Design a protein around this ligand. Structure first.
Ligand SMILES: Nc1ncnc2[nH]c(C#CCCNC[C@H]3O[C@@H](n4cnc5c(N)ncnc54)[C@H](O)[C@@H]3O)nc12
Ligand SMILES: Nc1ncnc2[nH]c(C#CCCNC[C@H]3O[C@@H](n4cnc5c(N)ncnc54)[C@H](O)[C@@H]3O)nc12
Ligand SMILES: Nc1ncnc2[nH]c(C#CCCNC[C@H]3O[C@@H](n4cnc5c(N)ncnc54)[C@H](O)[C@@H]3O)nc12
Ligand SMILES: Nc1ncnc2[nH]c(C#CCCNC[C@H]3O[C@@H](n4cnc5c(N)ncnc54)[C@H](O)[C@@H]3O)nc12
Lengths: 260, 260, 260, 260
């Protein structure tokens, strides 16, 4: 079937990509990077992130697979020396799809822009004090002062969210998690402190207080947005699909990356 | 219909209970504390906890309601001066049921005991060092050293779980959250650090390393369990049901208790 | 004696400044903003910070006093309605000097620049990943990956340092405290996690790993430093001197700002 | 000179102790465990703690040395295979004394008891809610609700204090650090949150609110104190003295125990 392979760009990953293409040449497999049905990423989680955003407009037709060339990633869970068995396994098919939730970010001006995040989306100010009003389902919840806020997907909770004190949530939970960055709390300023975990259909909305310029990130992309009236976070209707050939539980994946 | 009222025991709550009984005497309402269908609790969240555990063996036939006499509770969300409108509203019926998830705790010896928690269940040692192996779905995840562990329900995340750094999760999420207590981490000992959020059907299992005596709590109850071979945590099939007469969102309930 | 008054710039602070000058006109007091011996600041801690950095090259000849017009500050500890008693008290003299420690920051290129901080000095990258080697007294301590680092004075521990998890240390301790910003920790990357408190004469040195451009802050000032070979932190030989007329303990000052 | 050796009790430490005694038999060294001038501890930091408390009433006449048999300790900083060079080095003398500060704990009833801590002293309730008023230099600072409080020496900050979020402070700083255990914070209850670092001569005083029974620990000892009116913490006039033969900086000692 149609497939394509993206590479981190170094000597190891490039020459690994060519050997898998040569293997696929021995099967009923067509290379096409315009309309692939299997997207193989060789490199790190950054390379996987690129592959995801490269094809984010055909998510329900693509199954992703990641190979990690030098670390072990959360999205790239195949060893380079296991690439041969991967070629064969894919060649037959009848494999299994597992799906992870994604985060939708909407930015409104005084035309509205929408983004999709697999890890997280963060907001900071463009230099100067970051102050925003936090609104949950049209109800005012708190006035946040600090360095910024981070809204994470389930599979992203092991990334930036973890460094901010957030909890690691299993990706079978359709949720999003908001964490604080160096929140100031005193007698006059008051934030919840704790990470918040929202279900599907809950809309968290950030609204400027004075400054209307914010540095907004979605995964690895970061843009300075001018004249912002609203940022809206919610769990996306879209999901990312993975091809799985073997049992590799999320908590096992958490164990191997952080314990030993 | 059948109903009963529990009271915190002070002058304010007792005399409030009698006036509601007198009001119910003017309607098609029968008082029965053996088989109630509505359980009204007057006092604090501790009084609500007692009412829950008092009737925990008929959960799918009971709708709980809480009145708070001096603070505002997470489970008790009616003011004392609003008791009259509560009597009328209940008297008709046709109200709405909303359900929150609960946590099942199983303790195995070398007969097994099961408990139900609405807030959380915690484990500490009976004096001396607390060391347990943490096993997630039959796979060894980590060896925990510290003061103890805390497994929280969704609605309990605003209680002990919050003081331990856990996240507040919306109660429409069928999940449980495990948090650490003063975990020791160095070059030789290694814990995940972060709170973990588990879905339904995931079994977290604590297993002793040396000492087999632990002080186990379920909500307000705390018992020293001798000769423990296993403690098992999982999201209960049982749920607690609340009668609701008005919109009072969880995040609004979080706002009022912690922000202003 | 020689004195000057700086103002936040709003209607309240300006007209308060003029009335104190008019009061000082009734005493043996000369206004001079080139060589003052008493520096009065009217506004907030930001206004006090400006007054400090404005005269940071004559610290051992100046005693600072702060008046707060709308909050209560840590450095500005006099109420606007107490300004009259302040004028009289200053006019006699024979008051007391109390001194707080300061932080020296040195930045070396491949000419070296030195700065003085009353609150703290922070380091972040100029976009992209922040990676530095942390060296304590010429010995390599750790490789830090995250958002940045913050080195705080004693009196600054209640500012940014507090929001990063640092401890509040009494200003009679000649020390500096380093705190982490969203440090990444996994199986391969390893930071101490905890805040570190250094005595006089200990030199903490940050050294770039790849990128040599950092956004460095000293109190309110923030500059992008190009081609950085070393940043050096140590407790300054210089100290800031305050005129005190009444007992107002630091822990009382902490209490009023954060408890009630 | 007079010396004695304490041992962890296992086969490795006992037979190591006998060989050093046999070595000392070849020098001008007298074994005496009633009035030693050098106290050698073989085992772990727990064994060192015992040796310290065993001789805590002759601190200014004793220099401690620690050997670690199976880990590496903060107080025991000599390898078992380096014991021979230790015997020789001690035998001459003219070595160097370095001193670390200690914490004094006073417990008053309605006769007062005083204790000395090298690591820390903690307070919890004897089951039930822990509520105490925190008073700093006779001024009321906060009402603490939670699991307990921990007051740490400088060298103890790498022990329990570290697991509670405290900062690691260099032992040349005559200070003590207080950290919180699972403090409850909401709209009505309010704690500082942050660790507090106190200088010499500052007295922190805990006072019961309702319950007067507390479980008080000093290092490894833990006693249930009945009818408590006051607990007083302050930096002790006494100090512990170490014999040093080589440079082994505290931050190097921190590095080796937590980084690699
Ligand atoms: N999902 C994952 N789970 C576990 N590990 C993972 N690594 C990755 C990846 C990758 C390469 C491209 N990274 C861009 C991402 O850098 C994370 N990030 C940024 N600043 C920090 C920080 N100060 N502390 C921890 N993180 C940070 C966040 O993810 C941001 O989007 N993804 C995951
Ligand atoms: N669900 C809730 N959400 C928000 N507030 C709430 N208050 C309650 C309640 C009640 C009265 C009976 N309490 C027993 C419960 O004491 C909590 N707890 C114990 N030790 C601590 C601590 N050191 N720090 C915070 N908490 C603690 C935990 O809940 C334990 O089970 N329930 C909730
Ligand atoms: N010494 C003090 N103690 C207690 N409160 C204080 N307020 C001040 C002040 C002031 C007005 C000018 N501020 C510049 C200062 O903003 C602090 N800062 C920056 N970002 C954050 C954040 N995300 N979270 C908390 N802080 C932050 C830090 O101080 C930086 O230098 N000084 C103190
Ligand atoms: N000074 C030190 N620095 C770095 N490591 C060290 N290890 C030792 C030692 C030892 C063996 C006897 N221990 C009794 C001590 O157990 C610590 N402790 C108790 N509960 C915990 C916990 N939940 N988390 C971390 N700690 C804890 C505390 O020290 C208490 O007093 N001393 C130090």
């Amino acid at each position: 079937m149609k497939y394509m392979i993206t590479s981190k760009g170094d000597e190891k990953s490039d020459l690994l990509r060519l050997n898998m293409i040569a293997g696929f040449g021995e099967y009923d497999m067509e290379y096409d990077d315009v309309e692939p049905e299997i997207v193989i990423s060789i490199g790190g989680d950054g390379t996987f992130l690129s592959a995801f955003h490269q094809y984010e407009e055909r998510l329900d037709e693509i199954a992703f697979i990641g190979i990690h060339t030098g670390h072990l990633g959360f999205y790239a869970d195949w060893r380079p020396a296991e690439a041969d068995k991967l070629v064969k396994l894919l060649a037959k098919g009848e494999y299994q799809k597992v799906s992870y939730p994604l985060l939708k970010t909407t930015v409104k001006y005084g035309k509205e822009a929408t983004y999709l995040a697999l890890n997280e989306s963060t907001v900071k100010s463009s230099g100067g004090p970051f102050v925003v009003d936090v609104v949950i389902n049209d109800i005012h919840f708190e006035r946040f002062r600090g360095d910024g806020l981070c809204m994470s997907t389930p599979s992203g909770t092991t990334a930036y969210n973890k460094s901010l004190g957030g909890a690691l949530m299993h990706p079978s939970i359709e949720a999003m998690q908001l964490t604080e960055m160096a929140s100031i709390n005193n007698r006059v300023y008051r934030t919840i402190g704790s990470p918040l975990v929202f279900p599907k259909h809950h809309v968290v909305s950030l609204q400027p207080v004075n400054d209307k310029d914010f540095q907004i990130s979605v995964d690895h992309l970061s843009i300075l947005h001018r004249d912002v009236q609203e940022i809206r976070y919610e769990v996306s209707a879209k999901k990312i699909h993975f091809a799985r050939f073997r049992s590799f539980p999320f908590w096992r994946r958490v164990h191997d990356s952080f314990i030993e």
